[PDB]
Amino acid sequence: MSQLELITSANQAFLEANPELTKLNKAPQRHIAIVTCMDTRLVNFAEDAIGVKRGEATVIKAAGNGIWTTGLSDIVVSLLVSIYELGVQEIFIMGHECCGMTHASTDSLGAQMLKSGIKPEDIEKFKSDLSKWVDDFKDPIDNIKNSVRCVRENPLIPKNIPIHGLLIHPDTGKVTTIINGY
Amino acid sequence: MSQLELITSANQAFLEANPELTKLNKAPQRHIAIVTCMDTRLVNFAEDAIGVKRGEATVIKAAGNGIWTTGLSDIVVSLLVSIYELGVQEIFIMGHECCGMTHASTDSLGAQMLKSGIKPEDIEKFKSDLSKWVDDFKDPIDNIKNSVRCVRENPLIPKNIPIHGLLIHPDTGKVTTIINGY
Ligand SMILES: [Zn+2]
Ligand SMILES: [Zn+2]
């Protein structure tokens, strides 16, 4: 059985076990956006750890949960949609210990790409841009502090929207407040 | 209680109820990456719907789960890290019906920003770039098909990594295969 088949299969079983679900509002009912990491350990974990339930928040996830730009990015656009289209009033940026964006570099990714038959010329072309995500990621806490700053100083983001910074431990699920944005 | 206080509070309760949890591998154990939407309705839902458990996959989320670029983005970088650093062998891009990005436009976001006291000059500066996310998002299915294409044609992504396209219904949780990438 392929991974697709397993998903198809699991979905069938899911629909059987969940025959009639209540329609939820499309807008987050706590008016909050969470930005966090793609880390496998946070899946079906992080939200329970912060007491966030289905229908309550938008959740935005990328490797290292970073905003290093004050222009636009996938994450930034997600926040604009959250605020302006979906009524979000608070942003929580939540990094995690042992992120492994910490010990990821353009060198190591480059090496891996070469192994995978990626053209060296292509690796060089993108190395500089890629650096902005993986090499600038020094430390989880620093990244949180910096990310909270970059969202704040974004000219498209209203001054009356608090931006908080949190750190979650991927094993224990302990959350520690880094920045209170009120 | 503020939203931060609620989170702090819930975390305390979470740690009490979950005193000692088994450490999981930092790498996804099914070697799969899921790209999906930030939609409030998919939180604590989408993963169960596809039978994906904690520790099995990386999950990447942005408004409209779109890859329109063959350069770099938050989503793309997340996929590179997944494959090269974390051993991911398959990518599933999963859009949803009633996506908020369909009826989001630069006009509507602009209007909202103007309301919020954002400088008109700033709105005009970003309008062209912003267009690439919100205006190009025509239809969920078309976005899935196009996103699967843009990941495929990305020169940094190996040819031997299948890219699948799925559609989930945000109410029922029914998943339908759009593209099989094997
Ligand atoms: Zn991480
Ligand atoms: Zn959506």
Residue numbers in the entry:
A (entry chain B), B (entry chain A): 1 to 182
Sentences from the paper on this structure:
We report the biochemical and structural characterisation of a beta-carbonic anhydrase (β-CA) from Trichomonas vaginalis, a unicellular parasite responsible for one of the world’s leading sexually transmitted infections, trichomoniasis. CAs catalyse reversible CO2 hydration to bicarbonate and proton. CAs are divided into eight genetic families: α, β, γ, δ, ζ, η, θ, and ι14–17, which can vary in terms of amino acid sequence, oligomeric state, kinetics, and inhibition and activation profiles. α-CAs are the only isoforms present in humans, whereas many pathogens have been discovered with only β- and/or γ-CA genes in their genome. Here, we illustrate a full biochemical characterisation of TvaCA1, together with its crystallographic structure, thus providing the first detailed characterisation of a protozoan β–CA.
The crystals belonged to the space group P212121, with two molecules per asymmetric unit, and diffracted to a 2.48 Å resolution. In agreement with light-scattering experiment results, the two molecules in the asymmetric unit form a tightly associated dimer characterised by a buried surface area of approximately 4366 Å2 and many hydrogen bonds and van der Waals interactions at the interface between subunits. The dimer formation produces an extended β-sheet core consisting of ten β–strands, where the N-terminal helix of each monomer extends around the other monomer. There are two active sites per dimer, which are located in clefts at the dimeric interface. Each active site contains a zinc ion on the bottom, which is coordinated by three protein residues, Cys37, His96 and Cys99. In one of the two active sites, a water molecule is clearly visible in the fourth coordination position (Figure 4(B,C)), whereas in the other active site, this water molecule is not visible, probably due to the lower quality of the electron density maps in this region. Our crystallographic analysis clearly indicates that TvaCA1 belongs to the type I subclass. Indeed, even if the water molecule in the fourth coordination position is clearly visible only in one active site of the dimer, the aspartic acid residue, which is coordinated to the zinc ion in Type II β-CAs (Asp39 in the TvaCA1 sequence), is in both TvaCA1 active sites, very well defined in the electron density maps and far from the catalytic metal, leaving the active site in the open conformation. As observed for other β-CAs so far structurally characterised, the TvaCA1 active site is located in a narrow cavity spanning from the protein surface to the catalytic zinc ion. The comparison between the TvaCA1 catalytic cavity and that of human CAs showed significant differences in dimensions, being the latter much larger and more accessible.
